[PDB]
C-alpha cells in the first residue's frame, strides 16, 4: 500500500501565497503537491509533481521538470489569488515542455487546498511546513522574496470563534 500524508483539512487555504518543502530521502515513486479537502493527481482531487518520472499530475499526466536524486528538496508554491502552482527542485524553478513555470493554472478555488504527498513502496519523503523557517532549505532562494508564506504560518492557530 501507498502512504498518503496530508495537512489537517481545517487548515485548507482559499487565498494568499503558500509554500512548503518535500525532501525526497529516497528517489523512487513519490508525489507531492496540493489536495482538495474531502494515484495522486490522476483525478481532480489533487495537483501533484511526480519527481520519479518527471511529470505533473492533475486529471492525467504530462512531462514536467526533471527527476529527483536522493536528498533533493522540492519547493511547492501555490498562489490562490492568481490560481497558479509552481515547483522548485533544489531551488530551481521547474518548467513544462512549453517553457512555462506554471505547473498548473486557472484552477477553481473550491474549498481550498492542503499540502499532500504520496509515498510508494519502500519510499521515504518528508514534508516540512516551515514552523521553524530556518529548517526550510530553499525558501530563501525561491519563495521568500516572491511573497510565499510557509504553510505552518496557517497552522499555528488552534482556536476558532463564533457569535
Swiss-Prot record:
Post-translational modification: Channel activity is modulated by phosphorylation. Phosphorylation is increased in failing heart, leading to calcium leaks and increased cytoplasmic Ca(2+) levels.
Top-rank taxon, per record: Eukaryota
Expression across tissues: Highly expressed in heart, lung, cerebellum and brain. Detected at lower levels in adrenal gland, stomach, thymus, esophagus and ovary.
Changes seen on gene knockout: Embryonically lethal. Embryos die at about 10 dpc, due to defects in heart tube development. Cardiac myotubes display enlarged rough endoplasmic reticulum and cytoplasmic vesicles that contain high levels of Ca(2+).
Localisation: Sarcoplasmic reticulum membrane
Domain B30.2/SPRY: residue ranges: 1-134
Subunit record text: Homotetramer. Can also form heterotetramers with RYR1 and RYR3. Interacts with CALM and S100A1; these interactions regulate channel activity. Identified in a complex composed of RYR2, FKBP1B, PKA catalytic subunit, PRKAR2A, AKAP6, and the protein phosphatases PP2A and PP1. Interacts directly with FKBP1B, PKA, PP1 and PP2A. Interacts with FKBP1A and FKBP1B; these interactions may stabilize the channel in its closed state and prevent Ca(2+) leaks. Interacts with SELENON. Identified in a complex, composed of FSD2, CMYA5 and RYR2.
Family according to the record: Belongs to the ryanodine receptor (TC 1.A.3.1) family. RYR2 subfamily.
Protein role: Cytosolic calcium-activated calcium channel that mediates the release of Ca(2+) from the sarcoplasmic reticulum into the cytosol and thereby plays a key role in triggering cardiac muscle contraction. Aberrant channel activation can lead to cardiac arrhythmia. In cardiac myocytes, calcium release is triggered by increased Ca(2+) cytosolic levels due to activation of the L-type calcium channel CACNA1C. The calcium channel activity is modulated by formation of heterotetramers with RYR3. Required for cellular calcium ion homeostasis. Required for embryonic heart development.
Recorded domain comment: The calcium release channel activity resides in the C-terminal region while the remaining part of the protein resides in the cytoplasm.
Protein name: Ryanodine receptor 2
Originating species: Mus musculus
Segment of the intact protein contained: 1084 to 1251 of 4966
Amino acid at each position: 500500500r501507498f502512504r498518503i500524508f496530508r495537512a489537517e483539512k481545517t487548515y485548507a487555504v482559499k487565498a494568499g501565497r503558500w509554500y512548503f518543502e518535500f525532501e525526497a530521502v529516497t528517489a523512487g515513486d513519490m508525489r507531492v503537491g496540493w489536495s482538495r479537502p474531502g494515484e495522486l493527481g490522476s483525478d481532480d482531487r489533487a495537483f501533484a509533481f511526480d519527481g520519479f518520472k518527471a511529470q505533473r499530475w492533475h486529471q492525467g499526466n504530462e512531462h514536467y521538470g526533471r527527476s529527483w536524486q536522493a536528498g533533493d528538496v522540492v519547493g511547492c508554491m501555490v498562489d490562490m489569488n492568481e490560481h497558479t502552482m509552481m515547483f522548485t527542485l533544489n531551488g530551481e524553478i521547474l518548467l513544462d515542455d512549453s517553457g512555462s513555470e506554471l505547473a498548473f493554472k486557472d484552477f477553481d478555488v473550491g474549498d481550498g487546498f492542503i499540502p499532500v504527498c504520496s509515498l510508494g513502496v519502500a519510499q521515504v519523503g518528508r514534508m516540512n511546513f516551515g514552523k521553524d523557517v530556518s529548517t526550510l532549505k530553499y525558501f530563501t532562494i525561491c519563495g521568500l522574496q516572491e511573497g510565499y508564506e510557509p504553510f505552518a504560518v496557517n497552522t499555528n492557530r488552534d482556536i476558532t470563534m463564533w457569535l
